[PDB]
Design a protein around this ligand. Structure first.
Ligand SMILES: Nc1ncnc2c1ncn2[C@@H]1O[C@H](COP(=O)(O)OP(=O)(O)O)[C@@H](O)[C@H]1O
Ligand SMILES: Nc1ncnc2c1ncn2[C@@H]1O[C@H](COP(=O)(O)OP(=O)(O)O)[C@@H](O)[C@H]1O
Ligand SMILES: Nc1ncnc2c1ncn2[C@@H]1O[C@H](COP(=O)(O)OP(=O)(O)O)[C@@H](O)[C@H]1O
Ligand SMILES: Nc1ncnc2c1ncn2[C@@H]1O[C@H](COP(=O)(O)OP(=O)(O)O)[C@@H](O)[C@H]1O
Ligand SMILES: [Mg+2]
Ligand SMILES: [Mg+2]
Ligand SMILES: [Mg+2]
Ligand SMILES: [Mg+2]
Lengths: 264, 264, 264, 264
DNA sequence: TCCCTGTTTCACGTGGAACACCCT
DNA sequence: AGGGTGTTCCACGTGAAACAGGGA
């Protein structure tokens, strides 16, 4: 039993991290794999998108990072039996201060998530972490605990530099804390293929990263999440799109992403 | 005179903060008012949108907040003679550590931007600050230095929640540090009027906030930024839309926002 | 009393003449007024629509107009007690030859329906005549026997012309044979309001004829027959829509037409 | 050089005869065959559908049937070089009277169109005649002039009866005037395949006529003209949909009909 | 070089209709 | 059988964007 830990990360906000994390988790569960999703963002969209309103949540991931609880007590089960969730809440916005308090004394604070996870890394196939928007303490925790990193990219101008900064952050940690950190793939999100800016931004990214881009093993096609109002309406129903609408282009793209992850 | 300081702020990223700040700054410069735009985001998309490479940038606003420099030495003149810029760079990601130490030291980190701002408030008509996506120390400094706040809102499922969060921080600061802090307007961005999700999100926001939504004085119409790829392409040219294409509906909408701000 | 005689007439076929004639007859019969529907079409769709098999057809209207019989021996009772029928037959196609023999002679042939009708005009409240698709001798007899005229209109490219053609005939007969003949209304059929061609034809008709269009007295709304597959399947059951499905939109529209006529 | 004469005929109005005659003519001309289309309806919708309004026409088919002129002087050229038209006008409504005068004397009146046509039967590949709505003298001349007959069928209840009647008219003329008359095919028009009324009427027709229904040369699939608002807008442009939009489903169906006619 | 036009393609909202469950 | 639902499926209208060319 070993779980692969995959962080979905991008300092930039609004690029599809939470949409990807939730729907990739559900898409991997349908292939009868056991999935643990970790909302690592204080606003807690992944939690809300699975129907847990964060008025209702009592104990957070934050409580676990404090040692105030063990991760086994915070886990919640979802409408899908093979998808459980460690929820979030705005209390985790305290973690930033704790991080620096850690830096004050201890050479410790980068691995508060890795240590919180050790309890369960052997009871799931995949642990998917939904990261917040920055290269701050929460995202560094996220990347320091992960085997693999999924980078969802919206194909507009700021994605260019945005990636650069992100990758340098990974490679410093590849020499730092987490030498095993791997990029599992780039994933274009909200993808509108006919727009000129999209064609140019993807061309410029391909020039350096074509190797990194997610592909369909059967056909070798790129896998990209189309822009689809169905995927934006999904959180309004507390469900991932494969329960909410299984043949939408958005849902099909996320299930192809699951299979490609499933090759290796 | 005395500058009015407007923060462009929102709990979420990717909702058009940087787009609104840049294009509002430029649209007020056309009516020949003198404007300073402050990139207050470590990713620094505002800087990048006005054509400044971030490597070419030497000493940033971070230095100014740290006292290594004073705000007058970092200002740069732009392709618009009536629009200057305080550039940013990821070095400003250091500020949050400073922030917590400052609050540890003497409850001091929330007005370090306001103090850095005293040097120049009487040399501009408008100072526009573009803040990062969270309610973190940088955004807190932005809202604590400002007289008024523009909230750009993308009309998707979490907009209600996110704004509630932002408004509850604004209300803590009006009772704390900046009591005259005012809401200058909500501004719907990337607005696609035909989508059901858009109409539903706008109906729910109107029920609580119609009063705050920017309106064109002439006709009483709402001001909404249309979805317009020209606006996403403009920063790859280092220009604001009125220089890249002044007849775009995105450019027309931002000139209507500029005029509405100028009426009072 | 005197029965009011309404011709359902229009230069072109397939615009709904038979459907409105039949269902208007039934919808007025529900208000317990006694009505005779006169199939004046050799194809005899009204006959078949009330369940009469044309094997059972033995003595037609054609027999009556030649004097072979009087209108009272051809009438038949229908499943509605307040609705009887003069059936038709392809034998009625013989009448046009008779017509020209007639006009060769004595200006005789335009009123042969009117004369065959006065044997019974004091035994019904309404006489509804279902005319054939042209401005030929049968339709000429129909419009020459009638007090009022219903014009069903399918809203496609040639409707304008058709009505103009029909109108010119009506109005030559108003100075010729039947001077009190009046237009009781235009009635849009098979109406699907979303089509651009529907909108364009209705605008073109409104500009010349708005006054003539049937209206619901209660609200002043136009009465238009919706396109409704139920109304096309009803005659396969030998029924009018009010017996085949009373809550269909077709039946509701025809009952509002009935009510509007009952007002005068 | 022998021209094949094809009548487009059906007693019922509004079933697509003129739409079929026009678009079949145009679809055959594009296959480099020379086509003469004959408007045999006094309302003259085929003529107007090719852009010649009926105010503008000088001498019509009627003048020719009376012998007042010869068919070569009434012909008109179309926007397509391989399709000419003998136009119509409401003067042809006089022909019914002419027919019966003929009947008094000579057993002739059934072939006055056949007589008018011999003058040109050797200068066209196909002569397509667009018939009026009844089994009156005009349709009789049409079927007595033809080698073959195309029967367009709208699949509603009245197509059952109507069909039987038309065939008897043909079988009687196959014993009367035109012994080589053949039906080249049934053609379902305005076809909406999912409607239950459609499935049932086609089933009842297939039971007697499956062999007669038009089929695709290549696959043996039925050829049916889909219900398409583009085909109803087509006369609004004075053009057949082959020029007005050659990729609409209506246009594709008619060009498949042309190819199938062209196999034999 | 600018900028006018028309045409094509695409996602989304809309509503009539067949249908598989539903109640009972 | 009767009287909901809600679900899928289709054609059509709409509006943003790309584009081809047309234009002195
Ligand atoms: N493929 C897509 N098409 C349309 N909208 C999307 C898509 N993916 C995400 N969204 C919407 O975009 C917004 C940002 O997505 P989210 O996953 O919350 O990004 P992040 O977690 O990176 O901040 C949300 O409104 C979300 O529902
Ligand atoms: N009205 C608009 N239409 C189309 N794209 C837009 C619009 N406004 C912003 N964008 C694009 O959306 C992306 C995210 O917006 P940005 O302004 O950087 O917001 P934030 O500062 O909140 O992350 C950028 O690629 C930007 O060019
Ligand atoms: N409102 C309607 N919706 C759907 N089908 C209709 C409607 N009105 C008529 N029909 C059908 O259209 C066909 C033509 O109508 P019909 O009443 O026979 O026309 P006409 O008598 O003018 O030739 C018939 O099959 C009829 O069932
Ligand atoms: N396949 C089709 N889809 C939609 N409308 C059609 C179609 N065929 C014909 N129409 C329209 O139906 C009406 C009747 O067609 P038409 O060819 O005039 O029949 P007819 O010649 O038998 O009287 C016209 O408005 C016509 O444009
Ligand atoms: Mg998120
Ligand atoms: Mg920004
Ligand atoms: Mg009829
Ligand atoms: Mg016709």
């Amino acid at each position: 039993m070993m779980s692969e830990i995959i962080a979905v990360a991008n300092q930039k906000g609004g690029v599809g991290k939470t949409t990807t994390a939730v729907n990739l988790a559900a898409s991997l569960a349908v292939h009868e794999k056991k999935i643990l999703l970790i909302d690592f963002d204080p606003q807690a969209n992944a939690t809300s998108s699975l129907g847990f309103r964060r008025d209702k949540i009592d104990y957070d991931i934050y409580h676990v990072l404090i040692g105030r609880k063990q991760i086994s007590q915070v886990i919640l089960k979802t409408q899908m039996p093979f998808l459980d969730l460690v929820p979030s809440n705005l209390g985790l916005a305290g973690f930033e201060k704790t991080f620096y308090d850690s830096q004050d004394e201890n050479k410790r604070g980068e691995l508060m998530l890795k240590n919180a996870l050790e309890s369960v890394v052997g009871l799931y196939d995949y642990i998917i972490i939904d990261s917040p928007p920055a290269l701050g303490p929460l995202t560094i925790n996220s990347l320091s605990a992960a085997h693999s990193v999924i980078i969802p990219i919206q194909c507009e101008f700021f994605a260019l530099e945005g990636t650069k900064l992100l990758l340098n952050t990974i490679r410093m940690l590849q020499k730092s804390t987490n030498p095993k950190l791997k990029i599992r793939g780039f994933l274009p999100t909200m993808h509108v293929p006919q727009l000129n800016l999209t064609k140019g931004v993807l061309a410029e990214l391909f020039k350096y990263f074509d190797s990194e881009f997610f592909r369909d093993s059967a056909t070798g096609e790129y896998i990209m999440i189309p822009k689809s109002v169905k995927l934006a309406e999904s959180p309004s129903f507390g469900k991932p799109i494969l329960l909410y609408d299984i043949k939408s282009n958005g849902s099909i793209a996320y299930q192809k992403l699951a299979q490609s992850i499933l090759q290796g």
